[PDB]
Design a protein around this ligand. Sequence first.
Ligand SMILES: [Re]
Ligand SMILES: [Re]
Ligand SMILES: [Re]
Ligand SMILES: [Re]
Lengths: 116, 116, 116, 116
Amino acid sequence: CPLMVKVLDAVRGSPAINVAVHVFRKAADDTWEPFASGKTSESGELHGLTTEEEFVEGIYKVEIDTKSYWKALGISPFHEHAEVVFTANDSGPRRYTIAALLSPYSYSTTAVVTNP
Amino acid sequence: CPLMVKVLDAVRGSPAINVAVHVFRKAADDTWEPFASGKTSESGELHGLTTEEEFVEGIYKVEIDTKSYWKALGISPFHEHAEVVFTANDSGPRRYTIAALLSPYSYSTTAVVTNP
Amino acid sequence: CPLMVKVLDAVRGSPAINVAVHVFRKAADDTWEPFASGKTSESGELHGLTTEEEFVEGIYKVEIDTKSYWKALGISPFHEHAEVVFTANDSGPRRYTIAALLSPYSYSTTAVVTNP
Amino acid sequence: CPLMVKVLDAVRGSPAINVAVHVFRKAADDTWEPFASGKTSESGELHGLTTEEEFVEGIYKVEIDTKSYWKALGISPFHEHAEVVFTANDSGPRRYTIAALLSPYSYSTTAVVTNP
Ligand SMILES: [Re]
Ligand SMILES: [Re]
Ligand SMILES: [Re]
Ligand SMILES: [Re]
């Protein structure tokens, strides 16, 4: 419940299905440790990355790999990786939605952060 | 010139060229009155809409004829047109740049106000 | 189920609660007829505007009035109305989400259009 | 100059001034190599990053130090920095303009490619 990633295609007005998502957390030594991963559903969303027990304060990186999405559309992408880096839970637990909007020459990302 | 409009196409990664733009100003009876109109240049820009003297404080609406633009490129888009409203306060001379970024199912608009 | 409007605040990373939403449909005579209305919930979303029986093909306008949201934040907005106009159901029934992202000097809107 | 970066602040409706920008180029071993860096001017622009000869085909990452920018304005933002990737193909001379629009919880990036 506390972390959900959503990916949308601005050209098609559609969810982006089968986008690979990787989450890393910055460790003590300043390296990126693996945290969680998954693939977006039919609705362009990925739920169940983590639990409130595991999603502690820290610096997180969310990566998306869109190759499979673009190729399913018959598109040969010129690049296919996007990353965002943020601080989480630093004023207490919140629920986070990280949304990306894709097009060929533009990219947006927005975070919505709510209470219970 | 105190008012410029700039339009960008996120599908082509290009200025949006020859796009029709209409600017309206809210009248005292709450109707939108025509103010100026034009078509974007080869750089995606439209200047010469107003002199400094004609550009008074008020609530302005910029309407961008995205429908015709996308259809001319063989694309059937979502919106009939793109619209943004912006307010000009009274001030010393200020330049207002209205920037739109277009995709077939999404757009974003920003008003940049600078003291020249 | 077929039409949902969502409004988000990009400054705060939050849903925009109590935003008034009005939907109009273009009639035979080219006037805008009232269609539906409501207010966004805690989650920034408004569901239950219409039913598949009523949401027929046509040209629709979705208006938002953000005054109550901004004033609750202690903000005195310089304008507080946004509109989008689109064609619906023209290739068969779809579900539509119309999302707006607000900030003081920018505005985005995106439509996501899916099947069952 | 064939590469320019432009950064806009959606909270203030202004160019984002004195913002640090780093540009990296992907190397043959898949690492990001430093390419150039600078700070935005009073118009929100950064030019002089590269000569035409140094700007070869490749995959480029533009990192914008949004964290420091927002903190300097008294705002605690979501992202540690903003990142966009763009690819340059081999071609006749082309100008690449990378445009970012910043809010504390959202940003959008676009690559505009023009034939001068
Ligand atoms: Re991508
Ligand atoms: Re404004
Ligand atoms: Re608004
Ligand atoms: Re690109």
